[PDB]
Write a protein that binds this ligand. Structure first.
Ligand SMILES: COc1cc(O)c2c(O)c(C(C)=O)c(CC(C)=O)cc2c1
Ligand SMILES: COc1cc(O)c2c(O)c(C(C)=O)c(CC(C)=O)cc2c1
Lengths: 317, 317
């Protein structure tokens, strides 16, 4: 039976059939243990749930599904369509629906599940979707072979900063730079330092989970995983040629997300990304290291350029 | 008779006397050539006239007063008491009142005049005051002897940045850093780069007056002089330990201000300040160089720590 957590509160429905299964879980984002955490970012005084919030729940229903059938869960094909504003005024029910389909009777052969995230009063808004994948360790093995190359990019960023070539932002100064666009729940302000090579939207950052409070139970703490994606959002938005009064880069989702080691709330990690240039979309990979160890990887993290002013409008609509 | 300019529109009253004289001038800050200029900073969508606007008028009425009795005018003892919001909705008449006092027949020996700045509809608000002084060149001579020393502080700041010790902000990134506190009329965005030693609130900045448009006639262009004081305000507000969502440093005035060379709108200048350490107030000197030449100097520029939120309240009321 699925363990309830800070971010997954009850099972609404759990049905097996011959050609598939449906699992519906529910999270009251107004519940007092989670409401604070659900309010990750703040834009024009409007609180916003981060994609990492869905990713946590996805990892949970995926891990459960994968164990129930028989291993790494990949939160893949994440698409964030509509803002979720945790109002904190009476129940606000986020329903996460996981569906699986199969041949008879190869249920145990199943390597993916479709996941949808929608708030209910019933239906309020459909927010996001992803596909969880029960994946191989092939990527992990490949990442392990590239560790030394990632470490080299990181070292070269620090060397450049030490020569006056690249900007290095202390934690509070980085958040100040972003503050006309978004403010952050303090528990999400986990970027300790960030070195940015603006020419390639390329960043090396120390993320220190000890800098926030992360009480509760999770598969992947939404603050910890949002801090990882913040590094790529900062690389884009902190470029001297991006005028954040007019245009801002927002997280649209990603192609793949795997976690290989605990995201420990007493530890700091190294995060490296080269986003680059590219319609209204940029994409790139984000790796998380713990010294020599591969901790996590976003493949094809996607940020969308949106008008600052029209963002304001839609969020107030 | 006093030359009218972009920032001084008409003489309201001009009386000489046995024991002194009164000169009252008027500037309609809604007039189309000046209204843009008058709106130098923007806080919470509220436009604000900068202290440099009063300093320009002070130099003009001071130079005139000095010339008509019988070379440097010092805009000294500047105190900025109340915000001036150029609404641009019908006339908004800034009245600058200069008063002088003297012995019988000794008018020619007069070395200072009291200046007050108040808007009228009639009395609206009293904004600021200063004392213009007809001063010696002793300070100028002293500054010329320190040139090499100022240049050394500047070179040391650049050296430190080249070793990764001090922050260097490109123009647009500096203004992005300040943007949750204030936005700036583009004609005021003249800070080309700034290197900051946060430990001592110590900055060297290139200010490039060619970066804005400054059409009109002035004694000292309000954008150009404000850009000089921005270097000190930035030094304080860009400190990692100053949370601009809570407290901001605002210009309160200064003890002395002298200009020794034209502030040429095609030229860039070097500005150096060491504000140092946080009562309500910080103070320090700001020097302006053009290579080897002394161009201008604020002695005892004063910034006041004000609550960001309570700043908002007052301005909105
Ligand atoms: C206008 O469309 C959207 C939709 C979203 O889901 C959005 C969203 O989730 C966010 C979030 C979570 O931050 C933002 C603002 C940022 C990047 O800080 C803006 C959004 C804007
Ligand atoms: C609350 O009291 C004041 C009085 C002023 O005259 C103020 C003032 O002139 C200003 C400005 C800009 O001129 C400001 C805001 C800043 C530093 O950008 C804030 C002010 C705040």
């Amino acid at each position: 039976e699925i363990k309830t957590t800070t971010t997954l509160h009850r099972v609404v429905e759990e049905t097996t059939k011959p050609l598939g299964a449906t699992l519906v879980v529910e999270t009251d984002i107004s519940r007092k243990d989670v409401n604070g955490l659900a309010r990750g970012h703040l834009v024009d005084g409007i609180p916003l749930c981060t994609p990492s919030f869905y990713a946590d729940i996805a990892m949970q229903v995926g891990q459960y599904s994968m164990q129930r059938l028989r291993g790494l869960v990949d939160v893949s094909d994440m698409v964030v369509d509509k803002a979720l504003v945790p109002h904190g005024k009476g129940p606000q029910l986020l329903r996460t629906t996981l569906t699986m389909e199969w041949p008879p009777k190869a249920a145990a052969t199943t390597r993916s599940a479709k996941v949808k995230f929608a708030t209910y009063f019933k239906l309020d808004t459909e927010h996001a979707s992803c596909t969880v994948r029960f994946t191989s360790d092939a990527q992990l093995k490949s990442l392990r072979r590239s560790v030394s190359e990632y470490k080299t990019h990181i070292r070269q960023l620090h060397d450049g900063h030490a020569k006056g070539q690249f900007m290095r932002y202390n934690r509070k100064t980085g958040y100040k730079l972003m503050s006309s666009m978004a403010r952050f729940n303090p528990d999400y302000m986990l970027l300790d330092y960030l070195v940015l090579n603006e020419a390639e939207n390329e960043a090396a950052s120390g993320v220190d989970f000890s800098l926030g409070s992360s009480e509760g139970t999770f598969a992947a703490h939404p603050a910890h995983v949002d801090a990882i994606t913040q590094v790529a959002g900062f690389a884009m938005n902190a470029n001297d040629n991006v005028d954040i009064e007019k245009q801002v880069y927002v997280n649209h989702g990603w192609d793949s997300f795997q976690i290989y080691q605990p995201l420990d709330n007493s530890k700091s990690y190294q995060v490296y990304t080269k986003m680059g240039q590219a319609n209204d979309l940029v994409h790139g990979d984000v790796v998380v290291l713990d010294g020599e160890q591969i901790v996590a990887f976003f493949r094809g993290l996607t940020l969308r350029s949106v008008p600052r002013g029209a963002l304001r409008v839609v969020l107030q609509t």
